[PDB]
Amino acid sequence: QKTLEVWIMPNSPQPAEDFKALVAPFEKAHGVEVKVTVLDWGVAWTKITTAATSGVGPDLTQLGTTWVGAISAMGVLEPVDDVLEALGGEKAYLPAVWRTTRLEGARQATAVPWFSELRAFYYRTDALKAAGVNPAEMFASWQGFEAGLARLKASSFRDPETKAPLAPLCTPGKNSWDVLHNAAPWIWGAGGEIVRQAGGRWQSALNSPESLEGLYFFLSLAQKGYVPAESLEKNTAQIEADFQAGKCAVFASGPWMIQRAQVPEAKGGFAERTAAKNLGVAPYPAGPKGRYTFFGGSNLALFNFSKNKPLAKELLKYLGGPEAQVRYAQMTGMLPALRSAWSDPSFQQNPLLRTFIQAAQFGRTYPSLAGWGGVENLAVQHLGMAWDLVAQGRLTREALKDLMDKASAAINQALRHH
């Protein structure tokens, strides 16, 4: 009759149902009830920070890897070094994954790695073929990326269901954390970054010459008509929905879309759509200073005001452990956080998934900072205003610089305090 409450984000298309089937064996072996509540990504920051400040909430909460340091810095998370030792310690994890178990420079781990994700480009094989585009040259370089989009815009190809052209590229301009995650590769590729350590402190680098170069190149794809105006007002889920509906030739996303492509519309997938029958993946192109993609995922954290700490730690060890690592990655189409589970043969057979796995050497993420929640909110707000400059025909290098100088002022405030 002993019970646990868990907060999760929508990691699969039937998230509560998938999470319940995942924990059913643990419920049987301990004779306990695990309750699950689903928080949309757009409101999860608001709801998790309120639970933290109020001292009331669940036993466990999913945390995006980029939030672990920001929640940890509030002093509301129970140490989980014991759980991670029981899962095989530092050596069981990719160094980049291990760094998401804590606030940078904290002694104690405060989250357990649950799943990994990184970004690549999904494209329509039938569209790039009709346009005469070589996917290998389109996704090899900025120049190539731009040339491929120009061909996709000039193409007379029409989706056989919609009977209408495809937008060359769709990217979300509003409301998602992905307004930051989708700009990051371009910034990094130009030799830029989101933040930089100097003058003793962390500050915004979104106004560095190289950051402006990468961000401007990204924004100018919309300026040139490769991204439709409508896309700049939309969020992640809508861009996913536009691709599934046969309206976009190319978009940036995570390994989950592969799982969706294999499942019917009734189960929140798109197996019956033209796009699922014509699905390609290519990595992010090399920029002038490097080849990068966003690498992230989600960890599980235990609030220090939980009344069932020993039982919730047993559940973290279960979810962080090999068997649940494999089953949840299968249900979600995410990559296991436990490095050993990448080698499970169920992940070796899928050709599109292999593209994601082998793209991981280009994966980069943000330092695990106390101000990071604020940085992401302000980044989403200010980058969405840069997309606005395009919708208005007002995008210039000076206007972008002025806007990123204001984003930088505000981000510097957030890195001092909450």
Ligand X SMILES: OC[C@H]1O[C@@H](O[C@H]2[C@H](O)[C@@H](O)[C@@H](O)O[C@@H]2CO)[C@H](O)[C@@H](O)[C@@H]1O
Ligand Y SMILES: O=S([O-])[O-]
Interacting residue ranges for ligand X, rule: CB under 6 A: 9, 41, 64-67, 117, 176-178, 236, 254, 296-298, 376
Question: Which of residues 133 and 337 has its CB atom nearest to ligand X in the complex?
Answer: 337
Site string for a second copy, 353-392 (x = CB under 8 A): ------------------------x--xx--xx--x--xx
DSSP string, 89-143: GGGGS-HHHHGGGSSTT-SS---EEEEEEE-EEEEEHHHHHHTT--HHHHTTBHH
Contact 117, 254 (CB under 8 A): yes
**Distance in angstroms (rounded) separating the CA atoms of residues 215 and 228:** 18
**Distance in angstroms (rounded) separating the CA atoms of residues 170 and 240:** 9
Residue 79 contacts a second copy per CB under 8 A: no
State the number of binding residues for ligand Y (CB under 6 A).
Answer: 3
Residue 178 contacts a second copy per CB under 8 A: no
Question: Which of residues 175 and 223 has its CB atom nearest to a second copy in the complex?
Answer: 175
Residue 223 contacts a second copy per CB under 8 A: no
Quick one: what does residue 296 bind among a second copy, ligand Y, ligand X, none, with the CB cut-off 5 to 8 Å set by partner type?
ligand X
Quick one: what does residue 196 bind among Cl ion, ligand Y, ligand X, none, with the CB cut-off 5 to 8 Å set by partner type?
none
Question: Which of residues 48 and 166 has its CB atom nearest to ligand X in the complex?
Answer: 48
- Dig out the tokens for 31 from the structure: 């004779």
Contact 389, 395 (CB under 8 A): yes
Residue 413 contacts a second copy per CB under 8 A: no
For residue 233, the minimal CB distance to ligand X (Å) is 15
Farthest-apart Cα atoms in the chain, separation: 64
Contact 185, 284 (CB under 8 A): yes
- Dihedral in degrees, nearest 10, Cα atoms 193, 367, 198, 406: 50
**Phi, psi angle pair for 253, to nearest 5°:** -165, -175
Closest residue to ligand Y, judged by C-beta, is: 406
Residue 40 contacts a second copy per CB under 8 A: yes
**Distance in angstroms (rounded) separating the CA atoms of residues 255 and 269:** 14
**Distance in angstroms (rounded) separating the CA atoms of residues 319 and 313:** 10
For residue 103, the minimal CB distance to ligand Y (Å) is 26
Give the 3-state secondary structure of residue 404.
helix
Question: Which of residues 104 and 233 has its CB atom nearest to ligand Y in the complex?
Answer: 233
At a CB cut-off of 8 Å and minimum separation 6, what does 302 contact? 59, 60, 77, 78, 80, 309, 312, 313, 316
For residue 43, the minimal CB distance to a second copy (Å) is 4
Residue 406 contacts ligand Y per CB under 6 A: yes
Residue 193 contacts Cl ion per CB under 5 A: yes
Residue 40 contacts Cl ion per CB under 5 A: yes
Tell me the sheet residues that pair with 195: 204
Residue 396 contacts a second copy per CB under 8 A: no
- Dig out the tokens for 306 from the structure: 């939980």
Residue 296 contacts a second copy per CB under 8 A: no
For residue 109, the minimal CB distance to ligand X (Å) is 17
Question: Which of residues 142 and 366 has its CB atom nearest to ligand X in the complex?
Answer: 366
Tell me the sheet residues that pair with 116: 297, 335
Q: Whose CA is closest to 231, among 91, 390, 353, 377?
A: 390
For residue 352, the minimal CB distance to Cl ion (Å) is 24
Question: Which of residues 349 and 398 has its CB atom nearest to a second copy in the complex?
Answer: 398
For residue 75, the minimal CB distance to Cl ion (Å) is 25
- Out of 43, 85, 201, 346, point to the residue binding a second copy (CB under 8 A): 43
For residue 335, the minimal CB distance to a second copy (Å) is 25
At a CB cut-off of 8 Å and minimum separation 6, what does 358 contact? none
**Phi, psi angle pair for 2, to nearest 5°:** -70, 140
Residue 297, H or E segment = strand 293-302
**Phi, psi angle pair for 40, to nearest 5°:** -55, 145
Residue 410 contacts ligand Y per CB under 6 A: yes
According to DSSP, the β-strands at 3-8 and 33-38 are parallel
Contacting positions for a second copy (CB under 8 A) = 5, 14, 16-17, 35, 37, 40, 42-43, 46-47, 49-51, 53-54, 56-58, 161-162, 174-175, 229-230, 233-235, 237-238, 240-242, 244-247, 265-268, 272-273, 377, 380-381, 384-385, 388, 391-392
Q: Which residues bind ligand Y (CB under 6 A)?
A: 229, 406, 410
